[PDB]
Ligand binder design. Structure first.
Ligand SMILES: Cc1cc(OCCCO)nc(N)n1
Length: 154
């Protein structure tokens, strides 16, 4: 009972790009760029498409960094999130009515204004580690339990 999602982090040596969502899933939080994978579309193509739709950036090389499954108690569908990273992009981030992008210095990541699970796996992401994770939520703010392991292959 899982649904595929992508999440792209534009991570450069001294900064990361995040987008403040204006409405829908994750509204009011800084997030990476992503969404549902379409019929007949590979996970990687879905990740490239979402990055452009949401941030206006064109990604050249994408690297698979993680897989995280999210469960919301009472919600049947698990989110199977395939996490990607890039340092090679083209264009300038575009602010739209749906998304407000901003660059953050690595020591200034806004964890208090991000999904709570991010505080757990972003430190791995920053140290170029790959991971498999699972987070059980009750509502949007509480993590009931989780698992998070470093892996050699995503
Ligand atoms: C609970 C949760 C879900 C999520 O979903 C990202 C899917 C791509 O839009 N991303 C995070 N960081 N946390």
């Amino acid at each position: 009972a899982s649904r595929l999602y992508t999440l792209v982090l534009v991570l450069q040596p001294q900064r990361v790009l995040l987008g403040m969502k204006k409405r829908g899933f994750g509204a009011g939080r800084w997030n990476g760029f992503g969404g549902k994978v379409q019929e007949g579309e590979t996970i990687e193509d879905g990740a490239r498409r979402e990055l452009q739709e949401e941030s206006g950036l064109t990604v050249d090389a994408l690297h698979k960094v993680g897989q995280i499954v999210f469960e919301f108690v009472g919600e049947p569908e698990l989110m199977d999130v395939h996490v990607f990273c890039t340092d090679s992009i083209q264009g300038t981030p575009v602010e739209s009515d749906e998304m407000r992008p901003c660059w953050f210095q690595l020591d200034q990541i806004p964890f208090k204004d991000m999904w709570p699970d991010d505080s757990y796996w972003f430190p791995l992401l920053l140290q170029k580690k790959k991971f498999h994770g699972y987070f059980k939520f009750q509502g949007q703010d509480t993590i009931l339990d989780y698992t998070l392991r470093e892996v050699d292959t995503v």
